[PDB]
Swiss-Prot record:
The chain holds residues 40 to 89 of 160 of the full protein. Disulfide bonds join C8-C21, C16-C32, C34-C43. Residues 1-50 are extracellular. It is found in: Secreted, Extracellular space. This is Transforming growth factor alpha. It comes from Homo sapiens. Residues 4-44 form the EGF-like domain. The gene is TGFA.
Length: 50
């Protein structure tokens, strides 16, 4: 934890689109900070009243 979670290389980690992901390597898992005013697991739905 923290160690191998880094800052996602955004080629594949398109698990999120507009999502500044932390690529949890020990889990092989992208998990995302959706950009300011977006929602979604894939951080693609602008949250209208965003």
């Amino acid at each position: 934890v923290v160690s191998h979670f880094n800052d996602c290389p955004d080629s594949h980690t398109q698990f999120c689109f507009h999502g500044t992901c932390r690529f949890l390597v020990q889990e092989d898992k992208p998990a995302c900070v959706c950009h300011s005013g977006y929602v979604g697991a894939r951080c693609e739905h602008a949250d209208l009243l965003a």
